[PDB]
Design a protein around this ligand. Structure first.
Ligand SMILES: [Mg+2]
Length: 374
């Protein structure tokens, strides 16, 4: 059991200059007459880090003594050992681009590890955590970008796709104009679904409070990322004006930053949502440390709905008992989406028992991966 290679390729994202970096972790382990290769990539929103992967991380893994990257029985790779190996010579703090680089590699390490074990990643994770996995995952549709009729049509399209929770953007127009967009969508979906709004961290305290007063008059699913991701005091101050659920975290990339959010964000453990993106935040090895941080603060992993609409998110959700996943209908293909055949029904999908992350089960995506390394 050894990692023979680490291939990477970067390309623009499908339809401003956003990119996706795909990685391949090749091993010497063979399964059912075939070399096991792990694949991984970065969620949308942040630039692919194929550069750092090549320049710094990839070599550390290869130049590492294999006999030191194995589990106890030495019959498989130890994800944490590999993680620690690629993180040598890295100073504390500065959780930005490198978190995306490591997260993409980590995705591949786990994909391979699960394949070598011969089971679905979510099944393996549940096992490692001493519990049974729940293949049924709640998934909401994220969109509502920047008239009212077209917005309505967008949301209606999601409902006719099986979604019962949709999210739209706010803060990109005057507060009264957004009220119009919100009432429009609320009328369109009626009793068939719930609506979430996302400010994308645009608001300062006063604007956040102003929107809170407008938003609280509506039965919203949640109010997301009101201000700067690191302005914990601002988030804590919002509780006074908004009893309803709030969400944030997609732009915090370390367990240290997550710990600070729980210490100083004044969020409500019984109804708020944490959106840390596993893929963008040093990967699953790090996400598990973030979950321990949740525990130390009395939060349940069920409060997590990771940013990033892809199979890795689906696996960690079903595998770690998370609150759900997000999906961007028809976007970021072929990386985003579900395995071929699975569809959204009453706001949920059911994970098929595919080995590893399940990429091989999404033709359009796998063709991309084998074309990189096989
Ligand atoms: Mg968001």
């Amino acid at each position: 059991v050894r990692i023979v290679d680490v291939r990477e390729i970067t390309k623009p994202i499908s339809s401003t200059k956003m990119t996706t970096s795909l990685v391949a972790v090749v091993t010497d382990v063979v399964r059912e007459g075939k070399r096991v290769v792990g694949y991984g990539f970065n969620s949308n929103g942040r630039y692919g880090q194929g550069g750092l992967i090549r320049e710094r991380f990839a070599s550390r893994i290869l130049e590492a003594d294999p006999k030191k990257l194995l589990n106890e029985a030495g019959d498989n790779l130890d994800p944490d050992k590999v993680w620690a190996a690629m993180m040598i010579n890295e100073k504390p703090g500065g959780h930005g681009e490198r978190s995306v680089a490591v997260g993409t590699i980590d995705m591949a390490v786990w994909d391979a590890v699960a394949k070598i074990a011969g089971k679905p990643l979510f099944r393996l994770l549940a096992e490692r955590h001493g519990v049974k996995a729940n293949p049924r995952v709640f998934v909401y549709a994220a969109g509502g970008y920047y008239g009212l009729s077209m917005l309505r049509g967008e949301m209606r399209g999601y409902l006719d796709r099986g979604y019962n929770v949709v999210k739209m953007k706010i803060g990109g127009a005057p507060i009264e104009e957004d009220r119009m967009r919100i009432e429009a969508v609320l009328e369109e979906i009626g009793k068939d679904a719930q609506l979430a709004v996302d400010a994308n961290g645009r608001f300062n305290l006063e604007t956040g409070i102003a929107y809170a007063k407008m938003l609280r008059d509506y039965p919203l699913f949640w109010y997301e990322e009101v201000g700067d991701p690191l302005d914990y005091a601002l988030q804590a101050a919002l509780a006074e004006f908004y009893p309803g659920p709030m969400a944030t975290g997609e732009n915090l990339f370390s367990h240290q930053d997550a710990r600070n959010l729980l210490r100083y964000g004044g969020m409500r453990p019984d109804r708020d949502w944490l959106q840390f993106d596993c893929a963008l935040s040093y990967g699953l090895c790090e996400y598990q440390r973030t979950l321990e941080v949740l525990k130390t603060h009395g939060w349940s992993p069920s409060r997590c709905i990771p940013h990033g609409g892809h199979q890795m998110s689906l696996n960690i959700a079903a595998g770690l008992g998370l609150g759900g996943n997000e999906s961007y209908p028809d976007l970021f293909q072929p990386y985003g989406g579900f395995p071929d055949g699975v569809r959204v029904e009453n706001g949920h999908i059911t994970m098929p028992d595919l080995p590893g992350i399940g990429f091989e089960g999404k033709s359009d995506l796998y063709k991309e991966m084998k074309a990189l390394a096989e």
